[PDB]
Write a protein that binds this ligand. Structure first.
Ligand SMILES: CNCCCN1c2ccccc2CCc2ccccc21
Ligand SMILES: CNCCCN1c2ccccc2CCc2ccccc21
Ligand SMILES: [Cl-]
Ligand SMILES: [K+]
Length: 548
């Protein structure tokens, strides 16, 4: 029972909405097979060491994202930046959950709305194969998603977003109420119904893959998925996408792993947890991509169109694909209900931890918030609800893609780079290894220390610089955003990227003493401050820097 429960818990925390929603369309947009090489390379090199480092930091220091930086007082800015990024992500994460809830509600019927067109929301240009370079957007499923759910046809761009959709408004209200009621009592919510939610996604994926393999056109989709277009590997768009997807999917760099590890037993094995989580993450992503490409190859065969134009490359790819596969299953209503219930539960569980990260990180900084978890939870949830209500307008898909591109991109890459730089170079990679040994009893291997100190920061810096210099103006299918939209996106990214120097300056000015005294007080652990007067600072000697 001990091992099975641990395996189930790890498996349940891996698969999450990132894996089943964001990876499909990021892989499709990048050609499929060509997206796996950068994905796996970054997975190993950055994700595994950073996941392990965040787990170890949280477990040892027993502090949230903001307060964990008592070891290096200058990086509370990094803590605040990751907290802000976590706050930003929820705005559109909850909107995706609302879409899932809407589809679940719409699935309750014997005639699924996305099977054949002719409804009130269908344009005259519909084309139903059964009844008779553009992304199409004229099939029954695409028409349904883009008109009867988003009502995107009523917006001409990001400058004409319009008023919130009342149906999506109600769905967002329900999602937010569920989140609050599941977050107000405390952080302990597991061990009750995780059994069903820890296995339903994998069963759904298994049946979907088994059915998709045996479809008229799945062979072409699989061939495209496995084919690697090496010309795509030299543009840096695939590399930026892979890095951002790896850090969003693993959960490293959002301040959530630190907060959750703060509650772990002091003897808990972070190495095993990181290894298993990364392995499951990779395997699930690969299988999901396989199934997605099989389904879209079937669609290409059925729609008499090239595989590169069957469905959109935006955030609605899964909501346009999975209904198509479901319609091909016997008793489609039951399968649709099961699939969308699975999606809703998965999203709710993921978003719960995502918001708990911010709640705990901010509470650990001010004790008043910790003493009033209910009111603080309500405030955070209400702010998220309003800023997401901004994203369920008629032109809300444009704002959603703006956020999905600029909220956790270069911002999280810079935050994780600064986390690694701070911890390793300033605190001491040898000190971190000593803490890990004191916790689990064994010291990290040479590979982990090398990744923490040299390999991971180098790759992260390269990715950040390339993303900053190689920037593509935003587009959504055939829509090209106005320049001020790109400026607003970069401002959103900078809002979190810039908290680091601001806090460094603030700490330098607030500190009292001489320049060397200021640096000593800024690069020394708070509980270790009293050695500064004695003037033995390990950060001022070459040995601290050359340690490995
Ligand atoms: C024994 N506790 C740690 C394992 C479960 N734990 C994990 C597992 C993998 C990665 C992160 C975490 C963080 C805390 C958490 C939250 C919910 C379920 C499992 C876990
Ligand atoms: C792990 N992939 C992302 C899953 C959701 N994600 C959320 C959700 C809502 C708000 C913030 C975040 C930040 C990243 C994170 C970390 C841990 C669990 C979920 C999430
Ligand atoms: Cl992923
Ligand atoms: K995941």
């Amino acid at each position: 029972g001990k091992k099975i429960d641990f395996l189930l818990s790890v498996v349940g925390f891996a698969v999450d909405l990132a894996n089943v929603w964001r990876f499909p369309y990021l892989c499709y947009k990048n050609g499929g097979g060509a997206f796996l090489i950068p994905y796996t390379l970054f997975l190993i090199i950055a994700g595994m060491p950073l996941f392990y480092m965040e787990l170890a930091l949280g477990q040892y220091n027993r502090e949230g994202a903001a307060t964990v930086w008592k070891i290096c007082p200058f990086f509370k800015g990094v803590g605040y930046a990751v907290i802000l990024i976590a706050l930003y992500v929820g705005f559109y994460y909850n909107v995706i959950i609302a879409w899932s809830l809407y589809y679940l509600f719409s699935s309750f019927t014997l005639n699924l709305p996305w099977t054949d067109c002719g409804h009130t929301w269908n344009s005259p240009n519909c084309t139903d194969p059964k009844l008779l370079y553009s992304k199409y957007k004229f099939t029954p499923a695409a028409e349904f998603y883009e008109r009867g759910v988003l009502h995107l046809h009523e917006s001409s761009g990001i400058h004409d977003i319009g008023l919130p959709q009342w149906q999506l408004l109600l769905c967002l209200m329900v999602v937010v109420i569920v989140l609050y009621f599941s977050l107000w009592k405390g952080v302990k919510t597991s061990g009750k119904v995780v059994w069903i939610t820890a296995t339903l996604p994998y069963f759904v994926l298994f049946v979907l893959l088994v059915h998709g393999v045996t479809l008229p056109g799945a062979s072409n989709g699989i061939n495209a998925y496995l084919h690697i277009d090496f010309y795509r590997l030299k543009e840096a768009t695939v590399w930026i996408d892979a890095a951002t997807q790896i850090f969003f999917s693993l959960g490293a760099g959002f301040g959530v792993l630190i907060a959750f590890a703060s509650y772990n037993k002091f003897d808990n094995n972070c190495y095993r947890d990181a290894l298993l989580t990364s392995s499951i993450n990779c395997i699930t992503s690969f299988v999901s991509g396989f199934a997605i490409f099989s389904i879209l190859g079937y669609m290409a065969h059925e729609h008499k169109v090239n595989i590169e134009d069957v469905a959109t490359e935006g955030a609605g790819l899964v909501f346009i694909l999975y209904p198509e596969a479901i319609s091909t299953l016997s008793g489609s209503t039951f399968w649709a209900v099961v699939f969308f219930v699975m999606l809703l539960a998965l999203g709710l569980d993921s978003s719960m931890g995502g918001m708990e990260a911010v709640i705990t990180g901010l509470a650990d900084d001010f004790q008043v918030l910790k003493r009033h978890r209910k009111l603080f939870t309500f405030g955070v949830t209400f702010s998220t609800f309003l800023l997401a209500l901004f994203c369920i307008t008629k032109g809300g898909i444009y704002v959603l893609t703006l956020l999905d591109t600029f909220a956790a991109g270069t911002s999280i890459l810079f935050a994780v780079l600064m986390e690694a730089i701070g911890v390793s170079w300033f605190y001491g990679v040898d000190r971190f290894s000593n803490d890990i040994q004191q916790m689990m009893g064994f010291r990290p291997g040479l590979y982990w220390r090398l990744c923490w100190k040299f390999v991971s920061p180098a790759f992260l810096l390269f990715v950040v610089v390339v993303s900053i210099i190689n920037f593509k103006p935003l587009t959504y299918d055939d829509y090209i955003f106005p320049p001020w939209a790109n400026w607003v996106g970069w401002g959103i990214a900078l809002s979190s990227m810039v908290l680091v120097p601001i806090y460094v300056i603030y700490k330098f000015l607030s500190t009292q003493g001489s320049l060397w005294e200021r640096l000593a007080y800024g690069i020394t652990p708070e509980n270790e401050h009293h050695l500064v007067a004695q003037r033995d600072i390990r950060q001022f000697q070459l040995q601290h820097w050359l340690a490995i």
